[PDB]
């Protein structure tokens, strides 16, 4: 209503805690830039970009399969929780993606068969994006 | 005269916070304030926020929000 | 049509379907992606009503489901979805 | 007046024979007038209709509800009628029907709550020493029910007195039976009162009446079973007399004592279990060698329970129990009974579960070659269950020899056919797996011999054997024998019996599933033309198996058939996509997907769109389903432009078909439809602004399925654009159209957010026009029931007036 | 009440209760001589179906 | 590693030349040090004016001891 | 732009802390709730250090948390209330080091809603019923049971709805193997909405209501309902059955009250105040949290005020009536969100902000000359005590916490 020209939203994400700090910086020597945030609960997290399309498609599939095979522990829907006030837009949840390493070997085998890989190969791709930006 | 559609609409009118064409501004806003207070008590970091802003303890803030739920917005008209 | 939903608080009983309406959603009549298991209330699963079809009332041979669209819109969170015939009596059709 | 009160209690006829609304109204009326009516006339009218012989279960349930509601209002005004109520409903506690018992229990509970404990005791007391067993039985059951309703501590003193009475051993018997029925009815909720119940009944094990001793042992067994696994400190003063008594007694009393021992032993720790098991096992062998059927049925259960505890040793079991057990318990008279048969099989499986499969199987294998069909059947059941639970990791040579010899002989000599031998054969060979290489030749010879003749039920059994054994028949590095039996199967394809045909089709499918599509002896080029006319059969088993076989062929071996034949098969399968059976429907969907992937969309979609126009409704649904399947298997990139050219044709009844197709297509493809919203938006913009109501209804259906199918992928721009065209239709008087528009709006809520919907809706909530207000409050109530908590962040700021405060200040706080 | 075992067992058949019966009889008589507590929300309140039927009847 | 503060911190900035921090700390419902000291003095004198045997003074012990607010 | 979310340091604030034998052995652990994280902690009795065994993200909002076990069991279960319309029961598996979900029953819609339950959780002390409640109008009760394999069993829920009613706190009442009871602080607002003069809003009272669950008849009865003199926050379950009477303590502003149904009269004790307090004279005092400890011989309560002062509370009884309430200054600690008293004499304090602390209880039964306050003392005015450094507690451990980060 105010001005004629309007800005576009290109990203939406519910974090779960109230953020009071945001900064774009590099955290490790010889690493890439992240967006760092801190919450009112004492949490520190980062938001990092994908390098290629093929990386982004792999993590999307992992998140899509863990949403059904490893659903949240208190009966919430993951997509619904991340769409709390606005629908999620262009963010993958690596906290869910990294619960792969805590699953039972049967479920790890099934999910790796679905992704056409080996469980050690899935675990190694997760560690690779983490050590590229943060520790 | 008993259809599923008129059973759905009657059950919607039973959900507290729902209105009709004779709902007043006072009723609408009282509903808004009541579920705002319930949501502040539900979400932990909104309550942390308010407890830091007004230098009070969390139990005190919860008790105050509960006391404000009986008559928010003042008394009605007429 | 004198048909409503039960809409009472559902418990631990599981809804069944006869072989005519077997793979349908008990809410929207769709056949795409059965997602969530149907619970009915304790009154609608009692005595001679135990194991009957949720939709029509015939003999049940499989479990009833909510489709994915109804699950997404949270239509599984209302009451018992059994269809009640208001135009007739208990031991009627 | 007395003649009028029945005329008013016609409310009962209203309650029994009436619709739900009349029933609820009359229920209300009677529950508000119960006190004025009184307990006299109410029950004087309800009880005859309750003990009527033409009552049905649902009317009995309704009458139970009425009795509950009137007993809630009349609380002590029923004391002069408790005896009449009990005389009428003391049966229904021992009825054969299960729900009669439940309803009788509810009535007795509500009555015991309305009256007092003292009234119930004073009314039910005299029928405790009544010399009719039936009456004493029902009195004990009713006393257990009032105990469950009013708590055990309320009835503990009455029981403490009645179980120690000095004048009537019948009264003592009835009191101990009451304790037993309490245990049975209440279950593990007796554990806080175990010590008190055991202390009340423990003096009965040494009574001078044998009937009293027996009921005391049975009550101890019931309490132990209810308490399992907790509670053994409360059974000591019985532990000593019970073992003395099993060493002293003989007969029924001994049977009850041993049953109690058997329930108590799994409650103990290791040393106690071992010791008490040694004693009971000595006398238990003496009873192994016994005539009585009930005694043997008890003894089997006691052995099963003892040998399942932790303290009892596998070595002790092997050396002491197994020899006399297998000596006295495995014979044809044991095979002839039924209940004892089922108990013996379970006891033997569970004995194996602790002693090792080798011991049991090596002890009962040689009986697989016996002159008794029932004995062979029982041995096969036992071996199959054991090898299904434990496996074959411990089986060795000279034991597989006997196993295979026996199962082959038992399959061959089987005169009456039943699935026991089939499932035993299957389980044994699939548990062996790779290890049965040297036996497959004579196995296959036997299967071929059974398949070549013998009345077609032998043939169907052999076909099922092939079905469940082909996987191990190939994974054992073997293909020539399965190729040969596949040839002789393919020769059996014109049959008079549909259930045998289904089985041979299943065996063929299992073969083609595991054997290569190459390297195969019966050629696909000759198989499929034989398969095609079977697609017209109407037996469900034949249809499902045939379609699944054709699907497997089209999946793995598409490069052996011509696109012409694939086209014919597609058009023959088309109408089965709406078949009445779920299995046929899913099989047809899969097969159509495989065939469409085999050939391609270009010429199939041509004929599909062709017959979109010239078909009527019942045949159009299958065409819509087929179009959606083609778009799912071969990307909708190849389907959408051709489908929109069909809309470009200036004709209603064609544009509607295109719209229905698009709706079901987006609903079926789901999240894949996120790349194709922009391509379809112009058609939908034209369709949502159209004079024909069906156009707008179907276009709103399309929007709903698109928006729900893409959720969490970021198409908010496209869906906002479409929301602009959906909204003008909310002022629609037509029911189905407004119902489609509301569903589209609820789907767009999920896809876009409650914020944008609230922004559209805030315009007319306080419009001067009552019609606008009606419509907008409907939309708002939908948005409010769905996502009530997300709206806390999206409400607009409303300012304080003179009298009322409307600003939310906490949200204005700054840190 | 049915079990082939129950039939087998129930087939072979051929002061403290007074000090309790007396008091029980007296207490019962006193209870009887009285004319000669939690509320139940469900029984006294209309259900959703009852409310819907009432609304339809009203309009 | 932690460095204690007096009130609740809201913002800080960094001085580019020296890399020093400039912090502002604020609390609602609070007393400043001067207000606290004068309140303590006032309470002490309104105690010392109780008019009751004055020989035993709790005021001098009230003024000297202070409880650590952390 | 396409982004990826990774947590570096998880949240350290605490909302709820419960304690029990969750691994099944004789050790005691603590299950804490961060905001959206569930955590299991084990303090060592020999070193006094607290270790973290397990941390899980639940991707929701935890609103309530309770423990229970069944008669005869040696392992404790976990019940969670959240912002899903579900109630879940969890069990810890030590051999796998994971939380296994035992049961999950659905009753409504998602989000921190106003009339969907999830905000209050009450459990029967004997472990055979659990209530879950909303802030307005809706209460559900489930019945807990067991089979011969000792596996939990849950039933279909029973409704205890009440229109135009607000709930402050719900608590299970310790009756000993009688029918289960629940006690709530309620407030009906139906008349304050119809009075333009605003004096139905004034002089509207808070009630205390007792809900009885008939296990044999399978329904809920509202048994007792009594108005209160002043409004209270939370209730406290007094140990009953054979180890005490069976009532509740009502914590109000400036007072604490004991109540019970029957012939028991109400007993009130004012909350003592700091002598020479520099606070604003117009403020009242409330209790912010509590903890119960029950030995084989006696029981006591620990309760903390808004200033951090803990008071030890005991009850003087006769055959079955309570006659007096005694209060006594224990120690001063930072204001806590929850505190647990462990066997082996340790007090865990989860502070509402900042670092957490584990203390060792050095002295119970007091060899000192500080005064005790009581409800039987005549008073025209309030009680006055003097705060002092730690005397009964000894700091043993301290858990770092970054909450809250403001910049
Ligand atoms: Zn549906
Ligand atoms: Zn129902
Ligand atoms: Zn049906």
Swiss-Prot record, chain A:
The modification Phosphothreonine is found at residue 118. Signal peptide: none annotated. Transmembrane segments: none annotated. The record marks 89 as: Interaction with SF3B1. It comes from the Eukaryota. It is found in: Nucleus. Residues 18-41 are annotated as: Interaction with SF3B5. Component of the 17S U2 SnRNP complex, a ribonucleoprotein complex that contains small nuclear RNA (snRNA) U2 and a number of specific proteins. Part of the SF3B subcomplex of the 17S U2 SnRNP complex. SF3B associates with the splicing subcomplex SF3A and a 12S RNA unit to form the U2 small nuclear ribonucleoproteins complex (U2 snRNP). Within the SF3B subcomplex, interacts directly with SF3B1 (via HEAT domain), SF3B5 and PHF5A. Identified in the spliceosome A complex; remains associated with the spliceosome throughout the splicing process. Component of the spliceosome B complex. The core of the protein consists of three beta-propeller domains. Component of the 17S U2 SnRNP complex of the spliceosome, a large ribonucleoprotein complex that removes introns from transcribed pre-mRNAs. The 17S U2 SnRNP complex (1) directly participates in early spliceosome assembly and (2) mediates recognition of the intron branch site during pre-mRNA splicing by promoting the selection of the pre-mRNA branch-site adenosine, the nucleophile for the first step of splicing. Belongs to the RSE1 family. This is Splicing factor 3B subunit 3. It comes from Homo sapiens (Human).
Swiss-Prot record, chain B:
GO terms for molecular function: RNA binding; splicing factor binding. The record marks 2, 17 as: Interaction with RNA. The modification Phosphoserine is found at residue 6. InterPro entries: SF3b5/RDS3-10, Splicing_factor_3B_subunit_5. Pfam families: SF3b10. The keyword Chloroplast does not apply. It comes from the Eukaryota. Residues 12-73 are annotated as: Interaction with SF3B1 and SF3B3. The modification N6-acetyllysine is found at residue 14. Component of the 17S U2 SnRNP complex, a ribonucleoprotein complex that contains small nuclear RNA (snRNA) U2 and a number of specific proteins. Part of the SF3B subcomplex of the 17S U2 SnRNP complex. SF3B associates with the splicing subcomplex SF3A and a 12S RNA unit to form the U2 small nuclear ribonucleoproteins complex (U2 snRNP). Within the SF3B subcomplex, interacts directly with SF3B1 (via HEAT domain) and SF3B3. Component of the minor spliceosome, which splices U12-type introns. This is Splicing factor 3B subunit 5. It comes from Homo sapiens (Human). The lineage of its organism: Eukaryota, Metazoa, Chordata, Craniata, Vertebrata. The gene is SF3B5.
From Swiss-Prot, chain C:
Keywords: Acetylation, Activator, DNA-binding, Metal-binding, mRNA processing, mRNA splicing, Nucleus, Phosphoprotein, RNA-binding, Spliceosome, Transcription, Transcription regulation, Zinc. Its main location: nucleus. It is found in: Nucleus; Nucleus speckle. Zn(2+) 2 binds at residues 18, 21, 53, 56. The modification Phosphoserine is found at residue 89. One of its GO terms (cellular component) is nucleoplasm. Residues 74-77 are annotated as: Interaction with SF3B3. Zn(2+) 1 binds at residues 6, 41, 44, 80. GO terms for molecular function: DNA binding; RNA binding; zinc ion binding. Zn(2+) 3 binds at residues 25, 28, 67, 70. Residues 30-46 are annotated as: Interaction with SF3B1 and SF3B3. The record marks 12 as: Interaction with SF3B3. One of its GO terms (biological process) is mRNA splicing, via spliceosome. Component of the 17S U2 SnRNP complex, a ribonucleoprotein complex that contains small nuclear RNA (snRNA) U2 and a number of specific proteins. Part of the SF3B subcomplex of the 17S U2 SnRNP complex. SF3B associates with the splicing subcomplex SF3A and a 12S RNA unit to form the U2 small nuclear ribonucleoproteins complex (U2 snRNP). Within the SF3B complex interacts directly with SF3B1 and SF3B3. Component of the minor spliceosome, which splices U12-type introns. Within this complex, interacts with CRIPT. Interacts (via N-terminus) with U2AF1 and SRSF5; acts to bridge the two. Belongs to the PHF5 family. This is PHD finger-like domain-containing protein 5A. It comes from Homo sapiens (Human). The chain holds residues 6 to 98 of 110 of the full protein.
Curated annotation (Swiss-Prot), chain E:
Disulfide bonds: none annotated. It is found in: Cytoplasm; Nucleus. Residues 3-14 have a biased composition (Acidic residues). Expressed in several cell lines (at protein level). Expressed in liver, lung, tonsil, thymus, muscle and pancreatic islets. Residues 17-49 form a coiled coil. It comes from the Eukaryota. Transmembrane segments: none annotated. Transient component of the SF3B subcomplex of the 17S U2 SnRNP complex. Interacts (via the C-terminus) with TP53BP2; the interaction is not inhibitied by TP53BP2 ubiquitination and is independent of p53/TP53. ATP-dependent RNA helicase that binds to partially double-stranded RNAs (dsRNAs) in order to unwind RNA secondary structures. Unwinding is promoted in the presence of single-strand binding proteins. Also mediates RNA duplex formation thereby displacing the single-strand RNA binding protein. ATP and ADP modulate its activity: ATP binding and hydrolysis by DDX42 triggers RNA strand separation, whereas the ADP-bound form of the protein triggers annealing of complementary RNA strands. Belongs to the DEAD box helicase family. DDX42 subfamily. This is ATP-dependent RNA helicase DDX42. The chain holds residues 68 to 167 of 938 of the full protein.
